[PDB]
Design goal:
The structure is cut from a larger assembly and holds chains A, B, C, D and E.
Chain B lengths: L6 E2 L33 H4 L10 E2 L40 E4 L4 H5 L15 H6 L5 E4 L1
Parallel strand pairs in B: 3-4
Antiparallel strand pairs in B: 1-2
Chain C lengths: L16 E3 L2 E3 L9 E3 L4 E3 L6 E3 L9 H17 L7 E4 L11 E2 L11 E2 L4 E7 L2 E6 L2 H13 L10 E3 L14
Antiparallel strand pairs in C: 1-2, 2-3, 4-5, 6-10, 6-11, 7-8, 9-10
Chain D lengths: L2 E6 L5 H7 L4 E7 L6 E6 H7 L11 E4 L7 E7 L6 E7 L2
Parallel strand pairs in D: 1-4, 2-6
Antiparallel strand pairs in D: 1-3, 2-3, 5-6
Classes of the chains: A mainly alpha, B little secondary structure, C alpha+beta, D mainly beta, E mainly beta.
The structure holds magnesium ion (MG) (12 copies).
One magnesium ion binds next to helix 1 of chain D.
Chain B binds one RNA strand through strand 1 and helix 3.
PDB class: ribosome/antibiotic
Keywords: typeII release factor binding with ribosome, RIBOSOME-ANTIBIOTIC complex
Entry title: Crystal Structure of Release Factor RF3 Trapped in the GTP State on a Rotated Conformation of the Ribosome.
RNA sequence: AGCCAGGAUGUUGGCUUAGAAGCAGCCAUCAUUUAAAGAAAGCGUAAUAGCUCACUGGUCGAGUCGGCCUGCGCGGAAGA
């Protein structure tokens, strides 16, 4: 390895992945298999790539003393074991879901997804981001307005009104 | 994917499928029928071409036969039909025997589109690079 | 040092009766238990037991740490109690228990009937498992040893009385 | 950095000399220049350290005598015939 | 066990203990490494 | 130091190879997957092996490692 120098290094880089970062996910990894790497790196073949890293650096004293890149509320985000997930290029969307549906398949605990940076706070996995470049959800979102929400109430009596 | 349950790989060439002398009672003895190893194989083997070595998983439960999901061949045998000698190493690094270049082996690395641990279409280049240097082959990149 | 310098925390329930150099602990279960010490000085106070050396003794610490651990296992002793478990292997084995004396069949020309000691009882949930709880860690460990002894595990097929924490190497016989 | 403190020898000869290395010291000398040569005793384990650093034989060295800084170069060193210790050291007023 | 006058640990699972006045090697993997008189 | 994890993919590498898919064998030891993972440690295989090691993360929380110069002891050590 090395000393204080190797230390700072991993941080400034790992933490520039939080400064220049598109997104951030904190996932405790008890019982982490190599299949684990074989996943976020498989979901990197034909859907991601090297635009993502996830260095288990719960070195804390490291990854944390080294977020003077402005990462408050992360002392609370420093408990137990974690595997920092940081985005550089691409949207912040897809990356979150990957773990969301990984850990839910068992694939090691997800630290109840303690949440992370970008919005900046605590725990509560949302779905803002992943619904993007699927704007056909805004095609289906208009709900035909005048027509679909029509053929559902203005036209739902007959199929349920002759009682 | 899971882990372990049943799978091996012991063949010579697709040119002569389901051989007897080379493997025989060794091609499978756990749930694999020696005669049933010429039906699901050639169903896709004779479907593209025969010649190159083709190993494969041997997913075996307890339902009579077996199910093998095949993929890619050894990128090392691609030096007997698409490079030079009928052999390979023989005389490794005591003399500059064979020599390939950057040009060749390109579309050889291109075929394995579902068999490469490197999303970087460029990184998965130096991987087969060694697969053509395990016998004493210099590279004229 | 270390193990010695550690606490002990007398769980709300244990009597902790320090009479000079004699400590007696009773609680929940377990017929009390009361051992002795020597170069170690023990101190009660608060909700714990502290263990330290004693000037003039080079045994110190070393005698003190074993004090800790011992005393430690004495608390827990009467608290949770103590584990066990052995399984018999090989056709025609099997154990019994029928009181406080276990009857063993191990392929001799005779049963064995081993008689449990004081503060330790055991049951045979199965023909081939002996599980023996007790307070005195030092004693279960024995009766286990003592039992397993009638027929330690041969290293060829594995027949004999194992623990469960077993490892049984087992090897092939000389070639022909 | 090579700074070594010593004391002017009150005795000399194999007698006192063997009493030095006995009490974890050792004899030294300092000659050169128009200044008359000097009887010096150094601490073993101290200097034993400075001599392992290959820098000890190339860079000038500084000697403190009752507090008077001499500074010389490591002319010659006598080692033990079979142990890792110093026997005696010559020093030149350079 | 071996009663050599030099004991030496051999494997990595070989221990080296003094029980009574006697140095011994205790190997957990291989019993051929068991030794006394050291 | 324990204890919790992990230890792949090109690559079953080709090879004097009956069969060799890391370890009686030859020579090679290069490049990826990433926090680490050696064509390389061990048991030992009909051949797969199954299960475990260097090396990295976690827990814990103050020391820990091996040489050097020296003092005193242990084994080595059986006889009428
Ligand atoms: Mg670290
Ligand atoms: Mg005179
Ligand atoms: Mg004399
Ligand atoms: Mg004895
Ligand atoms: Mg540690
Ligand atoms: Mg482990
Ligand atoms: Mg093989
Ligand atoms: Mg080989
Ligand atoms: Mg082998
Ligand atoms: Mg790293
Ligand atoms: Mg280690
Ligand atoms: Mg001596």
């Amino acid at each position: 390895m090395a000393l204080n120098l190797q230390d700072k290094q991993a941080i400034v880089a790992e933490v520039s992945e939080v400064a220049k970062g598109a997104l951030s996910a904190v996932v405790a990894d008890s019982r982490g298999v190599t299949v684990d790497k074989m996943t976020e790196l498989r979901k990197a073949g034909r859907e991601a790539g090297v635009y993502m890293r996830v260095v288990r650096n719960t070195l804390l004293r490291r990854a944390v003393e080294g977020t003077p890149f402005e990462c408050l509320k992360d002392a609370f985000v420093g408990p137990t074991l974690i595997a920092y997930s940081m985005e550089h290029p691409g949207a912040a969307a897809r990356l979150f879901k990957e773990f969301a549906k990984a850990n839910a398949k068992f694939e090691v605990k997800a630290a109840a997804f303690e949440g992370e940076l970008i919005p900046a706070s605590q725990i509560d996995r949302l779905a803002t981001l992943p619904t993007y470049e699927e704007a056909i959800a805004r095609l289906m979102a208009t709900m035909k307005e005048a027509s679909a929400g029509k053929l559902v109430r203005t036209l739902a009596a007959v199929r349920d009104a002759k009682e | 994917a899971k882990k372990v349950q049943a799978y091996v790989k012991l063949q010579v060439a697709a040119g002569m499928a389901n051989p007897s002398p080379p493997v025989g009672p060794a091609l499978g003895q756990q749930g694999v029928n020696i005669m049933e190893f010429c039906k699901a194989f050639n169903a896709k083997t004779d479907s593209i071409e025969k010649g190159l070595p083709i190993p494969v998983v041997i997913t075996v439960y307890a339902d009579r036969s077996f199910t093998f999901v095949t993929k890619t061949p050894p990128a090392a045998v691609l030096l007997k039909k698409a490079a030079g000698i009928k052999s390979g190493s023989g005389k490794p690094n005591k003399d500059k025997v064979g020599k390939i270049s950057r040009a060749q082996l390109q579309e050889i690395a291109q075929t394995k589109a579902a068999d490469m641990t490197g999303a970087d279409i460029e990184a998965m280049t130096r991987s087969i690079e060694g697969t053509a240097r395990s016998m004493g082959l210099v590279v004229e990149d | 040092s270390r193990v010695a310098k550690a606490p002990v925390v007398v769980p709300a329930g244990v009597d902790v009766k320090i009479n000079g150099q004699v400590i007696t602990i009773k609680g929940k279960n377990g017929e009390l238990t009361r051992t002795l010490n020597d170069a170690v000085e023990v101190k009660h106070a608060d909700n714990t037991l502290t263990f330290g050396p004693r000037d003039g003794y080079a045994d110190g610490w070393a005698q003190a740490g074993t004090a800790r651990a011992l005393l430690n296992s004495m608390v827990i002793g009467v608290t949770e109690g103590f584990t066990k478990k052995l399984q018999l292997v090989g056709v025609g084995y099997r154990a019994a228990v029928k009181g406080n004396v276990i009857n063993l069949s191990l392929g001799f020309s005779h049963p064995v009937d081993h008689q449990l000691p004081a503060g330790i009882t055991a049951e045979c949930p199965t023909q081939t498992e002996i599980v023996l709880k007790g307070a005195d860690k030092q004693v279960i460990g024995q009766v286990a040893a003592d039992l397993r002894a009638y027929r330690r595990p041969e290293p060829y097929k594995g027949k004999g009385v194992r623990y469960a924490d077993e490892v049984v190497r087992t090897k092939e016989a000389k070639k022909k | 950095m090579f700074t070594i403190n010593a004391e002017v020898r009150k005795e000399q000869g194999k007698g006192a000399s063997r009493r030095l290395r006995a009490a974890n010291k050792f004899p030294a000398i300092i000659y050169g220049g128009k200044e008359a040569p000097l009887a010096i005793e150094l601490d073993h384990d101290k200097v034993m350290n400075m001599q392992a650093k290959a820098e000890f034989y190339s860079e000038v060295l500084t000697i403190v005598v009752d507090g008077k800084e001499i500074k010389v170069k490591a002319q010659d060193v006598q080692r033990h015939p079979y142990k890792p210790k110093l026997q005696h050291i010559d020093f030149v007023r350079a | 066990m071996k009663v050599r006058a030099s004991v030496k640990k051999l494997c990595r699972n070989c221990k080296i203990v003094k029980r009574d006045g006697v140095i011994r090697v205790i190997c957990s993997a291989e019993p051929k490494h068991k030794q006394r008189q050291g």
